[PDB]
Amino acid sequence: ASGMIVTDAGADQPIVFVNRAFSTITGYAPNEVLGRNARFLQGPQTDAATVARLREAIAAARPIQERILNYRKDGQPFWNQLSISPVRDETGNVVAFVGVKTDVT
Amino acid sequence: ASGMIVTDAGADQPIVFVNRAFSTITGYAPNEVLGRNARFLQGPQTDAATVARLREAIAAARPIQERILNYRKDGQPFWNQLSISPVRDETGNVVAFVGVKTDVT
Ligand SMILES: Cc1cc2nc3c(=O)[nH]c(=O)nc-3n(C[C@H](O)[C@H](O)[C@H](O)COP(=O)(O)O)c2cc1C
Numbered sequence: 001a002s003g004m005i006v007t008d009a010g011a012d013q014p015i016v017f018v019n020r021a022f023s024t025i026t027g028y029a030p031n032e033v034l035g036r037n038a039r040f041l042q043g044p045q046t047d048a049a050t051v052a053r054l055r056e057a058i059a060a061a062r063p064i065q066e067r068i069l070n071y072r073k074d075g076q077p078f079w080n081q082l083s084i085s086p087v088r089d090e091t092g093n094v095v096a097f098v099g100v101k102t103d104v105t
Numbered sequence: 106a107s108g109m110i111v112t113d114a115g116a117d118q119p120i121v122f123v124n125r126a127f128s129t130i131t132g133y134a135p136n137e138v139l140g141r142n143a144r145f146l147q148g149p150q151t152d153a154a155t156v157a158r159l160r161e162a163i164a165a166a167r168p169i170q171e172r173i174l175n176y177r178k179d180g181q182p183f184w185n186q187l188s189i190s191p192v193r194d195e196t197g198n199v200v201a202f203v204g205v206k207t208d209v210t
């Protein structure tokens with residue numbers, strides 16, 4: 001199943017919701033991740049240039065897709081086919097961001 | 106501020122997350138709405154044709170906006186400038202729905 005992360009729009013995009021698939025994929029329970037920026041999923045061999053593109057896209061509230069190396073709670077690396085999009089109200093205000101890890105199987 | 110509702114994609118789209126603004130707007134706490142379809146927000150003067158358009162859009166995972174009459178927990182009517190969109194993974198599979206109540210001032 002596809003993992004989903006929802007964050008606040010502002011400050012440092014703290015996580016406000018993760019679906020059940022997120023916990024299966026990453027080994028983290030909601031209470032371990034809520035209120036944190038999702039960058040804790042990154043680790044030593046995560047590609048800096050990819051992280052920079054995510055940083056610029058989120059700052060601009062621009063949708064982005066990247067294949068990024070992430071790490072489970074237990075330290076095991078996994079490839080995250082990650083897509084991030086802003087949630088806008090009808091005035092164009094950004095209310096949240098939504099991140100999806102596409103189950104590519 | 107703008108309210109946000111996140112639901113599962115399948116079965117009867119049970120609510121899995123509401124933002125702080127949702128509780129301020131509707132008078133419902135998260136524990137009062139989690140696992141329920143959002144239709145409990147409707148009441149006697151809600152326009153049936155508006156509800157039917159939402160029903161068809163969600164069934165087909167099509168984005169839709171409607172101005173729908175909803176009811177706070179205390180029964181006060183309020184105009185909900187509602188926008189709903191599917192959350193898709195990169196295969197096109199629907200992972201969730203997101204609903205926004207636009208704060209129009
Ligand atoms: C909704 C959302 C979901 C995200 N999910 C992930 C993720 O699953 N894995 C990841 O490495 N980064 C994810 N990020 C990105 C990080 O939170 C952060 O934006 C990125 O590392 C770039 O910014 P930084 O250079 O400040 O860390 C997500 C961001 C947002 C807004």
Ligand SMILES: Cc1cc2nc3c(=O)[nH]c(=O)nc-3n(C[C@H](O)[C@H](O)[C@H](O)COP(=O)(O)O)c2cc1C
Binds near residue numbers: 144147202203204
């Ligand atoms: C994510 C999401 C948010 C929704 N938010 C609202 C809402 O705020 N107010 C409302 O009247 N209906 C809302 N709905 C619509 C109802 O859940 C339902 O789809 C609608 O009443 C039409 O279907 P029905 O005829 O089966 O009730 C939402 C639906 C989804 C999927």
